[PDB]
Ligand binder design. Sequence first.
Ligand SMILES: CNCc1ccc2c(c1)N(C(=O)OCCC(F)(F)F)[C@H](CNC(=N)N)[C@H]2NC(=O)C(=O)Nc1ccc(Cl)c(F)c1
Ligand SMILES: *[C@@H]1O[C@H](CO)[C@@H](O)[C@H](O)[C@H]1NC(C)=O
Ligand SMILES: *[C@@H]1O[C@H](CO)[C@@H](O)[C@H](O)[C@H]1NC(C)=O
Ligand SMILES: *[C@@H]1O[C@H](CO)[C@@H](O)[C@H](O)[C@H]1NC(C)=O
Ligand SMILES: *[C@@H]1O[C@H](CO)[C@@H](O)[C@H](O)[C@H]1NC(C)=O
Ligand SMILES: *[C@@H]1O[C@H](CO)[C@@H](O)[C@H](O)[C@H]1NC(C)=O
Ligand SMILES: *[C@@H]1O[C@H](CO)[C@@H](O)[C@H](O)[C@H]1NC(C)=O
Length: 335
Amino acid sequence: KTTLFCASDAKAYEKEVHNVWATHACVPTDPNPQEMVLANVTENFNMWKNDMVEQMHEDIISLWDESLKPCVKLTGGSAITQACPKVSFDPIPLHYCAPAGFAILKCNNKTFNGTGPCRNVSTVQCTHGIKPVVSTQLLLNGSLAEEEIIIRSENLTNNAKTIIVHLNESVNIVCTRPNNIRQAHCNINESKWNNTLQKVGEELAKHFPSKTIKFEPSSGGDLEITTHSFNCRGEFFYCNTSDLFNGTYRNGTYNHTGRSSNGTITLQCKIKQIINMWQEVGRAIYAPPIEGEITCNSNITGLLLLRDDTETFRPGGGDMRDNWRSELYKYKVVE
Ligand SMILES: CNCc1ccc2c(c1)N(C(=O)OCCC(F)(F)F)[C@H](CNC(=N)N)[C@H]2NC(=O)C(=O)Nc1ccc(Cl)c(F)c1
Ligand SMILES: *[C@@H]1O[C@H](CO)[C@@H](O)[C@H](O)[C@H]1NC(C)=O
Ligand SMILES: *[C@@H]1O[C@H](CO)[C@@H](O)[C@H](O)[C@H]1NC(C)=O
Ligand SMILES: *[C@@H]1O[C@H](CO)[C@@H](O)[C@H](O)[C@H]1NC(C)=O
Ligand SMILES: *[C@@H]1O[C@H](CO)[C@@H](O)[C@H](O)[C@H]1NC(C)=O
Ligand SMILES: *[C@@H]1O[C@H](CO)[C@@H](O)[C@H](O)[C@H]1NC(C)=O
Ligand SMILES: *[C@@H]1O[C@H](CO)[C@@H](O)[C@H](O)[C@H]1NC(C)=O
């Protein structure tokens, strides 16, 4: 309804680029913030149409211009060339704050699906701290749902609408290029992955009850969405998830069809230099990988899925606003 401002712990001394950008762009966070509670109020919310998501999207686009300059950017006819130094890159949390005369309502119902009426409501200055993590397929380093796994969708009956699975328990994923030098891999403990898809399958069955629930790899598209793609320490990782989204939830029980060894699923990754951009329709070209070990230890906190008797779910992504939705779903700007 209005233009929000960002607050952060950034550090004028960190040369990490999120810190630099936030020192320029954000104000410091208020050390004790005021919440109010209002359980009588009940208001309505719609995570799929939230101006906060657009404002954040704009900020993160700007932060990626400042911070991860491509050596070459092609959009339309034009190629744009500029210096592309290697940088220190580690996302920091950002708070979105309502300006004077404006407030942010937070939905306190622990099981709110992002849509409709919410009974217990609060007013706040600012959202919680949201790390702006760019990825497809898996949502990384988010905040977990406090009670059950939540299924969010603009319209579950419309198979073209992205599904966000909000996990109540995180799944560790460790991705590393060790010190071919594009080659990398991710490890996930099969026990957890196995549990969580059983539990996701149970919820998905609640919404599609007759059907058997299967998980299968991404059918097609650009490599950024057919693999789990993300940025680790500046480098763009593309990680095959054929062994991850590979399973059947038949009859109260999940079977994992993907292959594992020593109870560990291992994803083969490549570090790439030609990137299909998430900011606009275009290509960006970056320099070859920095040397040594590149490792990111992350928590999977959510999934992005697309639906195709049987209902069958494949990993999705591509529109980074959904990532911001998955964190901003409980907030609305008012007055
Ligand atoms: C929701 N499913 C549909 C879908 C599928 C795929 C994509 C979209 C949408 N896009 C979209 O919505 O753009 C927003 C609006 C705009 F600008 F495009 F208008 C993208 C269009 N960009 C393009 N074709 N070059 C495309 N996504 C990526 O390329 C993408 O994520 N790359 C990527 C790079 C680096 C990392 Cl680390 C990463 F994690 C990811
Ligand atoms: C979310 O809950 C609302 C009711 O509050 C319901 O109308 C809608 O179908 C639900 N959506 C999903 C994806 O569960
Ligand atoms: C998480 O949610 C699932 C399904 O919604 C449920 O089975 C489980 O008990 C919940 N709590 C956890 C895993 O702590
Ligand atoms: C969402 O699903 C379908 C789209 O195929 C259509 O009925 C309408 O857009 C929505 N329906 C419901 C029940 O919300
Ligand atoms: C992932 O690996 C499988 C087999 O290892 C392969 O068939 C599939 O095409 C790969 N997917 C991508 C997007 O590279
Ligand atoms: C599941 O994994 C096995 C081996 O890891 C592979 O042969 C199979 O194609 C995968 N399933 C799908 C649907 O791709
Ligand atoms: C997730 O957070 C951890 C701890 O801050 C960090 O080491 C890791 O690299 C993050 N992952 C991504 C993809 O940003």
